[PDB]
């Protein structure tokens, strides 16, 4: 069937003008230019008329897009510590995923070094000793380190059929979350990070350790942006 490309409506054209297409790993898929001028793919592509939806299959392979400078620049690095009040909103739709499909990361904040930030959709994982399931998780690292104590782990909400907000702000080295209009992640710590001056947002699907290399994660974006102050 006829495959319609984001850029056919205006509401996703502010952030395909901030943003590049990796897929299906880091490699570029398409540059800020390509996106405004109508790429489509079924990787990527406007479902129902109205959906940004991404969609991989394969351990750690990605249709994500990465921040960019606005208006054809190059990759973009920010740090959390420089002042600026840092923001990506969005809304996501989160269909039933197939079996196979883990974890999903639909947003970051990632840098140079490590990820400071993933949200993701979860099948199934405890937290500080309770059993969560099918729920949308942040993980915050406060250390390069593979240990727990390098990560804060939080129970987001369960998902939704509907439509979930999402914004995240970073200001003066702390990080907020608001899900559905309510703080769920307020004034975390990221000072650890001060001086790193390479981070940038990234949205889409990301997917981490599926049991099956053929399962396909999909996740839909209603909205979209990510913006300075
Ligand atoms: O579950 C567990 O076992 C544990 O997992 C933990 O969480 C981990 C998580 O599961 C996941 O593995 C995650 O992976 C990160 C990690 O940093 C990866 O290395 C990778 O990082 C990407 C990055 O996102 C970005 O895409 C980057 O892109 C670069 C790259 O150079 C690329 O080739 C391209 O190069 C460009 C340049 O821009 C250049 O300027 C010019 O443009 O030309 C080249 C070009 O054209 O090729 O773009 C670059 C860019 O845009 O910056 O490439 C990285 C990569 O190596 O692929 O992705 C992951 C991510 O996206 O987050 O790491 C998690 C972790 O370690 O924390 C925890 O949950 C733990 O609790 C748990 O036990
Ligand atoms: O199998 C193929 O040939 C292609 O399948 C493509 O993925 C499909 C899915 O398999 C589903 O059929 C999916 O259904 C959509 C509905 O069309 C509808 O948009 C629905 O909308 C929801 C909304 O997401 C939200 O939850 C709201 O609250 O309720 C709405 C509602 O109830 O209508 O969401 C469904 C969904 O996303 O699961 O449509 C996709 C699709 O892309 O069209 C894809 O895998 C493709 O590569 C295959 O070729």
Known sequence: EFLTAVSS???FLPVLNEAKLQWPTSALAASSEE????YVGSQFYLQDGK???FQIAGSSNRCELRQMIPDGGSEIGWAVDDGTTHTATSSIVVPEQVDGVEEVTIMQINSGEAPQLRISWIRSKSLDGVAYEDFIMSTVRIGTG??????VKTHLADRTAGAMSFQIDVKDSKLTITVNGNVVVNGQD?????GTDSCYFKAGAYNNNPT???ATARIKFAALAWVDH
């Open 146 to 151: 593979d240990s727990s104590d390098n990560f």
């Open 190 to 194: 990221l000072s650890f990070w001060d």
């Open 35 to 38: 996106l405004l001028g109508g």
């Open 212 to 214: 099956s290399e053929s």
């Open 9 to 11: 409506i205006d509401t």
């Open 51 to 53: 959906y940004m939806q």
